[model samples]
Target: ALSLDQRIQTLAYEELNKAVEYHQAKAGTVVVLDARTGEILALVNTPGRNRAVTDMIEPGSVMKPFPIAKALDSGKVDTTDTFNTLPYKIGPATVQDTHVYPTLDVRGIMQKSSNVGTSKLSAMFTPKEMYDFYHDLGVGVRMHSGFPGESAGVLRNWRKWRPIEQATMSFGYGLQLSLLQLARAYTVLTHDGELLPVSFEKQAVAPKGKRVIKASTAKKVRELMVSVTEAGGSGIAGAVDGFDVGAKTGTARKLVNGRYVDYKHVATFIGFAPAKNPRVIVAVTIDEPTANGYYSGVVTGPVFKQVMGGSLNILGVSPTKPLT
Candidate 1:
């Protein structure tokens, strides 16, 4: 009964195919959503596996904004606040960034994907508050899209969380969610902190959204997300010409059996363009990329740029930034 945007869907498939082939990735999926309407414009899964909705993986740094948004909305932290970015000790475990920094503001934490900074900020909120924020964002919930093998993923109850568990969850390690769920979560950022219900069927009218955070908070968080695509940010490759891009890059270690492996990673990039007024949201993930690179910015960022730029052109969305 439901239908897909054939043109946009085709564009997504073609672009995703190129990335998968070029990177020699074992698997990959891309989901494109309308920023305003929450309609699923395109969904691509290589070799016929609907992993975007079925397979769950740790979201990596893409999960950072959610907790940060919650902390800000609760007045526990301000945008101007700074945190120590050096390796942090939470009991016996250590939270670190890929590159250590002495200190960074809230925006710099996102730009650099600083685990220590994010976890330190996350400590401002109680377990219940963080859990509710993730819940409202649609984590651990099934899309009910009727996909044959949909997975609800996991978000353990706050009552069950330990110090280290909460710390790790802040930067996205202990929890799990499908790529589709992650894309749906980003809709909150685009929709002024209102979480839109995702749909594959062509919507006759824009569905109402559930308010999650304040509009002001969403705008502030969006500004922080844009920093991730700026110069020296973790997701600069995700930037597109003539458009302001906002996004998060993720490079989560692949878990095998009972442990995580260093060499294998799930690279991801989730973002929207023309930051002030986003038209489309694209979420891409490449599993175990083994070719040129494995970092999210390096592996999945270009895919996001290509697919987003092509989708925008097809949608006739105008460029907000001048093309140099």
Candidate 2:
């Protein structure tokens, strides 16, 4: 197993960082975490002043999967759940997807990344419940790593959130988390529902995981997440040859000074590899990409694919499937 806080790098070191530099973003952050041991394997901040732990960015659709998990835990939605996925309108704001669907199951929703379905799913929970759920998942929170410039992030003013605001939060707006925090929240699913504490310091043994969801729920979500990188998903570019993978993509326009910036955007991809029993979780965030219109699957998915593929190979991890 990958041990605690090892500064380990596979053959992909240059390839991983080059993925960021090639995107030509203002800044980029890449975090690779050990799934079983909860150790951080590689935390590559850009050579030009790394940006993962310090500045916060809206996580966009990357936040979608957590809500789907929360809804499952609440018993408000089922793992095989279906949604009447039409364009969802909440007062002034309308939630839409690049690909419209008349109906979708949970897997389809995750694969296609339907904002309409996700916002509608968010409405299944009350604002208070949603806040507690996200809080438990470690959003808008800071890890006591004593890393300088770490941010607590911004949360939706829950008590004051309107219907639209709450819906938007489900689809990844109205809150901000540092790229590191977004990756950290995922530990809840990585170790089968354990919301492992965010640790910047190294540990000799694997840290304990506090249960956030049942193992069954996490497994269900993990299975569905794999489809995000399959044939028809937005993350198709992230697919590796032999190993299964699980990932989510996020692309959000930066809202600054009470207005949205059209030219500036954040793209992030977070996922783990060897999906049958994942070893490393690779998360990449490219801040303000100027080309290809800034989609997470487009900008960061290949990075995740390259890094996780290399890490697994260098670590001598055997493929979980029979070779073709």
Instruction: Put down candidate 1 lDDT per residue, 174-238, tens digits, no spaces.
Output: 88888889988998899998998888887887689999999898888888888889898899999
Off by over 4 Å in 1: 1-3, 253-264
CA displacement after TM-score superposition, residue 206 of candidate 1 (Å): 2.6
Per-residue accuracy of model 2 over 135-157 as CA lDDT, tens digit each: 87777766765567777778865
Q: Which stretches of candidate 2 lie over 4 Å from their true place?
A: 1-13, 254-263, 322-324
Tell how far residue 246 is off in model 1, in angstroms.
Answer: 0.5
- Assess the local accuracy of residue 81 in candidate 2 as a C-alpha lDDT between 0 and 100: 79
* lDDT computed for candidate 2: 0.76
Give per-candidate clash totals.
Answer: 0, 0
